């Protein structure tokens, strides 16, 4: 007497209890939980491609790479469907902390092009420490590719993913600054 199965479109955003659909931009290892309904009562989730993504027995998802992928939800009464996770423009990835000089190096020339970037990730996914991969962290301050202007003063600005906190004119050689890349 079971019902059609189906993975709810809107997704749950672990990072900020804000229900909606997957964002165009991604915070690597970000996390959203999927919802199933009808058929059996149990539900089993699995992901087409593991690199790009993953999910635990509950729907909590962790994006671990850039690209597209599909999640298969199978109900205990052999009823299975897929939810497609389509690639983003860019997906922020956090490498090791280091002076802007090498930040720009680490992240092979790919550093956030402007503050108007990470801000979005935050506005969207929220505080990085909300997610599993982070959480055990209270600080993440990012490099933002210095503009010739602030280039001359030998500095650049930052953004703290876990806290926003924009800081202008920073020593392009201060310790405690993560080298966030942009894929």
């Amino acid at each position: 007497f079971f019902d059609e199965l189906k993975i709810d479109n809107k997704v749950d955003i672990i990072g900020n209890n804000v229900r909606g659909e997957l964002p165009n931009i991604w915070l690597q290892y970000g996390q959203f939980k999927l919802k199933a309904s009808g058929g059996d009562g149990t539900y089993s989730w699995y992901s087409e491609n593991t690199s790009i993504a993953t999910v635990d027995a509950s729907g909590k998802v962790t994006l671990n790479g850039k690209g597209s992928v599909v999640i298969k939800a199978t109900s205990g009464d052999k009823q299975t469907v897929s939810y497609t996770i389509k690639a983003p423009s860019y997906m922020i990835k956090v490498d090791k902390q280091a002076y802007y000089a090498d930040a720009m190096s680490i992240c092979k020339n790919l550093l956030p092009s402007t503050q108007t970037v990470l801000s979005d990730i935050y506005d969207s996914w929220g505080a990085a420490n909300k997610y599993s991969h982070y959480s055990s962290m209270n600080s993440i301050t990012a490099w933002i590719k210095q503009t010739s202007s602030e280039q001359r003063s030998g500095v650049s600005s930052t953004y703290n993913l876990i806290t926003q906190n924009p800081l202008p004119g920073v020593n392009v050689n201060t310790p405690n600054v993560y080298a966030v890349c942009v894929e």
Partner: protein, 63 residues
């Protein structure tokens, strides 16, 4: 020379205004006194003391 000091006084006169100091970051994304002047401001200062030197010379020469 004379510039020697014109250096040390403007270098210090500079650490009176924050917007000349570079900033450093601590354990928790907090801003704190780096202990350095922005390359361009120091740049100018150096550029000044020299000139001030080419002053009490191009003038110390009053016979």
């Amino acid at each position: 020379a004379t510039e020697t000091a014109t250096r040390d006084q403007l270098t210090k006169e500079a650490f009176q205004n924050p917007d000349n100091q570079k900033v450093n970051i601590d354990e928790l994304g907090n801003a704190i006194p780096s202990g350095v002047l922005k390359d361009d401001v120091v740049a100018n200062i150096e550029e000044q003391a020299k000139a001030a030197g080419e002053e009490a010379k191009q003038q110390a020469i009053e016979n």
